[PDB]
Amino acid sequence: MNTINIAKNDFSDIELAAIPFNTLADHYGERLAREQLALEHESYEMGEARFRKMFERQLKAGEVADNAAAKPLITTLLPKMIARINDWFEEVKAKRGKRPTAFQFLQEIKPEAVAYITIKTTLACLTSNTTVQAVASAIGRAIEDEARFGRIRDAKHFKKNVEEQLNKRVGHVYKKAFMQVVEADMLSKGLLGGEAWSSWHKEDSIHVGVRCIEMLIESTGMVSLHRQNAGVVGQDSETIELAPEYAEAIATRAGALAGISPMFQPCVVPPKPWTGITGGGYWANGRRPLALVRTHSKKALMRYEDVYMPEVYKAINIAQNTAWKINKKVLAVANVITKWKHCPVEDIPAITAWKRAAAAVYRKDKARKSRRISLEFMLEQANKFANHKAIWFPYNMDWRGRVYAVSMFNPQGNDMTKGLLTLAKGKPIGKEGYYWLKIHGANCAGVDKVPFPERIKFIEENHENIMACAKSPLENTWWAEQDSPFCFLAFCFEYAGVQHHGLSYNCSLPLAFDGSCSGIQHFSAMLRDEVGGRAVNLLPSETVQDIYGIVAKKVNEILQADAINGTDNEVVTVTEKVKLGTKALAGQWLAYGVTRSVTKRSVMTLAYGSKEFGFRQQVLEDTIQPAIDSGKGLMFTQPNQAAGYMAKLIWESVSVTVVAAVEAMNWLKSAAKLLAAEVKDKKTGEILRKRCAVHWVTPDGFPVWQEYKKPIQTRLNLMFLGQSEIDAHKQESGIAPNFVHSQDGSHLRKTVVWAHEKYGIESFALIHDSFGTIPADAANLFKAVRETMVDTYESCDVLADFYDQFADQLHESQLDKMPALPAKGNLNLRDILESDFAFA
Template sequence: MNIKSNLSETPLFARQVELEAESLALGAQAYEKSHEAGQEAETRPGVSMLRKAVLPTAERIVQFIEEAETGKSGPRHNALPYVARIDPEEAAYLTARCAINGAADARMLQAVALSIGNAIQAHLDIKLMADSQPGLFHKVSEQLKKSTSGRHRSAVFQRVIAKHGKRAVSWDEREKLLVGKKLLDLFIEATGMVVAARMTDGSANTPIKLHFTPEHLAELEKAHAKCALLCPIHLPMVHPPRDWTSPYHGGYVTQVLNPRLVRTNSREYLDDLKNADLSQVYESINAIQSTPWQINTRVLDVIRDMWDAQENSPALVQRRDEPLPPRPYDVPEGVPVAQLTLDQQEALKEWKMAAAAVYEENEHRASQRVQMAQKLYVADRFAPEEAIYFPHSLDFRGRVYPFAAYLNPQGDDVAKGLLQFAEGKPLGARGAYWLKVHIANLFGVDKVSFADRIKWVEENADKLLDSGLDPRDGERFWETADSPVSALAACMEFVSYTYNGEGHVSRLPIHMDGSCSGLQHFSALLRDPVGGAAVNLVPQDKPGDIYTQVSNKGQELSDGRLEKQPEFSVAWNGKFKRSIAKQPTMTLCYAATKLGMAKMIAKAVKGEGEDYLGKDAHVFKSSVYAADVIWEALGEIVVAARGAMTWVQSASKVISATNQPMRWTTPMGLPVRQAYWVEEGQRIETFVDGKRVTLTLVTDTDKIDGRKQASSVAPNYVHSLDGAHLMRTALWGKENGLTALAVIHDSFGTHAADTDMLHAVIREAFIEQYAGNLLADMRDELIEQLKDHPDLIEKIPELPPVGNLNLEGVRDSLYLFA
């Protein structure tokens, strides 16, 4: 083990070294466990083997068909009429998949051949349904979307095909065995990856089994060993993280976990980072990861007890499965459907659909329970520690992420509720003020002024105290919050404040979130007074709510379409609301399309109730209409954001014409390199266990994918801006005495006593970031990139106009982050 550190060799340091070795071992164990539980062809080494096998096998299938069609006699030609019906590449994929899985388990040759025949038949049947009955296929696929059981999905599709669809082929067992055996022979001939052999005493009665050849088995085992080492389960640290001083050194104290500042495999980009001045980047990340945390044992005790008691709570994933609905009492079992009355058939159909929905939801919850158990394991493991730490790294845009899996400050509500700062600070009067604001926010009372939030807390003080004092046997008001476990932690803190007053020593992180942060950054970028007002860049008596503004504007525009589109205008009369407009508005800056917005609106409509738009409304068509209306509304409210997005997209097309990655530098000095390459090769699409599966047989070329570059640059650029703002906030916060920081992209938290300072730092950092013209800086960098292509410089579009928004007003805008 190579340890390079100037940290003292203390017992704590030695424990940390052991923890990092354990992280590696835990990852290897988890990998081996998932490998044993799953199918070989679905592992990374198995997929790699698949990719190598498919094209040679497909070529051998084509060769077999061509040879057989010459008319030469031979027993192998018995399979020709069957094999000739199958697309060679699809057949090759399914054959290779079954063969690799069979060889991994040393299955009998006949069983593997039959599995190939079954896979081919099921694929052809479902493919026929997808092509000839797309509506039925889509309906069944949607119903099975959450199902994690391949056997269940396959069985459902087979039942539906038997009742409503057509079969592409109707093979008996002998025919499936014939097809499978021939395809398996062709796979073995083409790849040499597996052999069929008797592996015992060689007697005639010993079944023939499939095995990997020695060289391929050795290659596979070596690949699995490497994967196991490359999949560590990162844990919190008990020793302060090593400061980042280079792109390769920082965070964890040893090199066994191979920490990197930026998560990328691009050697060229990492070299760029080594040559850049990243001093501010290092300082900000070091400030974030130096925050000492603790497990909030009061919350852990409650959540652990509820979990062990298998309580069903809105705060947790359901501990027990939902019971399947009872079978209709008047529908006899064992009677063919055709012999049932029409009413009985309809009742049976409805029962099966309801039972399938419950089954699939129970399957989905199973994986959520595993994740919950993992969080509690880590919380229990580190609960005795006085301080734990979370080392952080970046993505290529400069967004900050913790390494630790399962439990970290950027986790879900349960994860955040289980964590508190290790250092405590007395509340004081202002800390008590911010604690109350925080509590109201957690309960969804965040669209009103701070004064009204505090009033709400005071009016509900008895319920909050009951939750904190008696979380399990009381009224459980905490479970009604938007973030229940975080609310439970806050209610417990409220109890301590109520009894101890402003002298109460608090460890609770107090969070403040941005208002649709993507639009905040774009509005500041172009000094947009309209968009800026909508996202709280100007002082207001209460927070502006852009989602409500967009929904109101959408309603106004929809009402104006009554004569042109009466059907949809009437259906949407009075139905545009905040929940409908939120997702489309939020994702505008992230390259959302009208079609994407329509899907978001359709989901929101279903969430409002089955008949929200009327019993006869076509939900998706109505959602397409609403998306067009919302798109128009956004165009009127956030004009500048659209202009900035269009400019960076147009500029990226010019750079792509030179076959270069798109490069820019964030306001904190981090070089960003966006490079999406054209992929060469093909994709093979099949149906496995009722699920559409695509094998990608492609590799990156040395040609830039201009279309993907253009579609990705706006979201990547705005993420680089919010990442830079977070870094500057962390850096300035430390300089101004903040000793603890919780950060999640557009959300910042610290001690209640320090929240006034953090609140001010957030706004000052925002003003400073946009003091210049960042788009002009970006244009200058792009022109430098084009120095060898002077003819293209003039194709960089003119910068969009800058408005008259006074960014100094941000200093007094209390609801910029609130």
């Protein structure tokens, strides 16, 4: 209800405590220590204010039970209510006479569901008319709504196709409106048994809630009952109050939670070097200390305390030390255009389907608001730190070891954020620096599928356009028309500077180089796949290699062959419909024209574990369904048959193109499945080998543990929200994408330390496979990122090491099931050193 302010004493400690102050002051002076500790203090202040506004809205909406401060108490009272429900039902049955008027109503709703519906609706009613009648009414109408529309949910098979559309709607009235529509539809089909719901009358609903209110006072006792003006027929009223201890418990938990949810901001001094698991980054001893590894359990964090990973610690601290500053020139442009357009680069002037169209505009209206709120935060943070000579971002890691910045405004964000951020410590650009400055500008414009010589040609041909954009960014919109506009505009400014000030010009712009498909690149390196490696530019090639265009080419080759040969159409009975043959289906697709657009997402999702089944849903939504809406797709007479046909063709094309990827992810999936199973002798039933997690260690020395854990029980209501064992399926789903991500994290970490030690590089722009530095150091970073990758996969056999980790854990029945290690290929790793387009 009412929460005392954390801020007055406990946030005051952040600036007061001497040991955090002295440690900061010794490194960077008292005054930078003053600013940093006050800034970290404000970060905690902003975070507490964030909680208070959300709590106020949730209290107003009756959604306090949804808030985290109210979840712990509800978990305690819920069993007591349920037990009292079940006993009441048994006690009412035992007694003889007319059954109480709520008995029948309470029965169709699950005893768990009534329990939560009463607690939430009573908490909603009390925190937002305390009379028992209004709350009993409010309970009853909620019980009936779960009763009437629940019938649809459990029926179930049809509900699975209406489940998503229910979720896509926001707000109870919209959820209820949609459910009245489906109920009418399914009643017309006769699915619900043809039984139209007879609405409860008001006096019934009142009696439903009162029995619930009584039942909580006996069992739980949070609410208590009070009678006003007893014995007077006019004013005899009964009222409901919350137990103060329970209100104090949410209030204590609300305050406890507000002090541990800061809004992290950039540092005005270099971030605190990591010496251990906790307390890196920000310098204050804080209520929410940073962790080196972002984990879901304290235990998975504790495993890292013992481990000796000097190279992991060095890489994070080097990355933290990178000095950034706000690009004021970009910020000047963004401050203007943002006031005029919701998205500044969105609409530049330049020279059943209806139901699906309505869903699109609804999503578009959501997307506009969500996009703009992120924009407003980034600009405000950018304008805040604009006048600082440098700022710094702390770094930590996810549980797989990938590196992420900690502050909400960070260099790993969207274009506008990336454009608003530049490095602080620049060097004179030089001939080689100018060259990569133009290559970077070419990539920001979207000229990336072309060799470097034509990338330079594109920049130099558009010299006058680039110059005009830098001189008047508001008068020439050409930069906004580019693929990465603000980052392109950032290049335009530095390009203009080099021409004004020559090659002596000091440029501090981050020149990002990104691996084309890092997962397939890594998988191709492990098993030495030549064909896969060439497709992802691991091996030197005549031109840049587009894996989508390659797969599209192989798809089109099948289509042309399946147009001359291939099955005729046939008629199949279904519970008679025509089943289109491959010859018909090929003709439809050739009529559409299959490009890299048709195959792109399928290749991207390959590292995530997607296969032929998942491609059909991709193909339908990405190309076929938009084609029908556009008035194309007359060829797609049966859309699902076309998608399934094309998904087969994409999967065959992908698997023969990158064999190492397909084989390696299968081997890891088989490993996790065996380890995640419980081994029980069928006759005895006893479990011989328990369910086991998956663990490996990166060549960088980062350990990682995959323990996806499933909760035992869960509850779900239609209109109100729902409120450990190893999850074997998530273990198999996650093992291959997580393993390859742990490798690219090690590659990134090994790159920054190698670029820092062999070469002089001190500034790093890092987005998981994108490696950036100032132009003067661009050539060496290009060198460094290739040298690391060749070294690890010459030094280490990551899959064989992985096998050595879990081979002991395997049970004797499982060993025949385990596949062998995939065969190595003919690729030579030293060709990666001379590969122009790997970028990594």
